[PDB]
């Protein structure tokens, strides 16, 4: 598991393509995110209709959700839910003719990873351990 920016970009591109717009770690994360959205279906649907994205509320919407998600700490499932949440935000932004928000969201996700998730990820064997646990 190399660069966080690359992980974020490859993830967002996939989520957007699935909705008609535009390495083992990238594939494992993709598969995990699709599994998460299927298992927690009501949470997924509730999140998708509770963003109410506008040009000047997207930053605040991202901050409030990511704070609640990791309030009690970090684990692999919560990191998967964080990528899925980023995906939902990007898809809604493109759907609402606010596609430059995708670049802002990608930056907020990369910054959150580098600054607030990096220590946990490193202390738990990095993305390689995520692949050892959940990959092929
Ligand atoms: C109660 N309040 C606190 C509510 C507020 O909650 C808020 C607050 C804020 C936001 C949101 C929010 C709502 C909507 C959106 Cl879109 C985003 C976020 C919510 C909503 N929640 C966010 C956190 N969610 C969690 C957390 C941890 C775990 C966990 O870790 N479970 S697990 O059994 O360890 C596990 C099992 C299998 C696998 N992968 C296996 C795959 C198979 C396919 O091939 C690849 C590997 C993994 N894994 O990959 O990490 C781990 C969890 O469950 C699963 C179960 C199956 C899963 N599948 C892949 C991941 C996954 C996680 C669920 C619950 C919902």
Swiss-Prot record:
* Protein name, per record: Apoptosis regulator Bcl-2
Any one Gene Ontology MF annotation carried by this entry is: channel inhibitor activity
**What tissues contain this protein?**
Expressed in a variety of tissues.
Q: What is its main location?
A: mitochondrion
What membrane topology does the annotation report for this chain?
Single-pass membrane protein
Its domain description in UniProt is: BH1 and BH2 domains are required for the interaction with BAX and for anti-apoptotic activity. The BH4 motif is required for anti-apoptotic activity and for interaction with RAF1 and EGLN3.
Q: Which disease is it linked to?
A: A chromosomal aberration involving BCL2 has been found in chronic lymphatic leukemia. Translocation t(14;18)(q32;q21) with immunoglobulin gene regions. BCL2 mutations found in non-Hodgkin lymphomas carrying the chromosomal translocation could be attributed to the Ig somatic hypermutation mechanism resulting in nucleotide transitions.
Where is the short sequence motif BH2 located?
Answer: 119-134
Family affiliation? Belongs to the Bcl-2 family.
**Position of sequence motif BH3:** 25-39
Q: Transmembrane helix as a keyword?
A: yes
Key words of the record: Apoptosis, Autophagy, Chromosomal rearrangement, Cytoplasm, Disease variant, Endoplasmic reticulum, Membrane, Mitochondrion, Mitochondrion outer membrane, Nucleus, Phosphoprotein, Proto-oncogene, Transmembrane, Transmembrane helix, Ubl conjugation
Kindly list the biological process annotations in GO that this record carries. Answer: actin filament organization; apoptotic process; autophagy; axon regeneration; axonogenesis; B cell apoptotic process; B cell homeostasis; B cell lineage commitment
- Sequence motif: BH1, positions: 68-87
Keyword Transcription regulation listed? The answer is no
Please indicate which part of the intact protein appears here, giving the first and last residue numbers and the full length: 8 to 204 of 239
Q: Where in the cell is it found?
A: Mitochondrion outer membrane; Nucleus membrane; Endoplasmic reticulum membrane; Cytoplasm
Per the annotation, the residue ranges of the short sequence motif BH4 are 3-22
């Amino acid at each position: 598991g190399y660069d966080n920016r690359e992980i974020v970009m490859k993830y967002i591109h996939y989520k957007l393509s699935q909705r008609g717009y535009e390495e083992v770690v990238h594939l494992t994360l993709r598969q995990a995110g699709d599994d998460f959205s299927r298992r927690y279906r009501r949470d997924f649907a509730e999140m998708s209709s509770q963003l109410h994205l506008t040009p000047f509320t997207a930053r605040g919407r991202f901050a409030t959700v990511v704070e609640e998600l990791f309030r009690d700490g970090v684990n692999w499932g919560r990191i998967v839910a964080f990528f899925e949440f980023g995906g939902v935000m990007c898809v809604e932004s493109v759907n609402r003719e606010m596609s430059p928000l995708v670049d802002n969201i990608a930056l907020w996700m990369t910054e959150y990873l580098n600054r607030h998730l990096h220590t946990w990820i490193q202390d738990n064997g990095g993305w390689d351990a995520f692949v050892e646990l959940y990959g092929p």
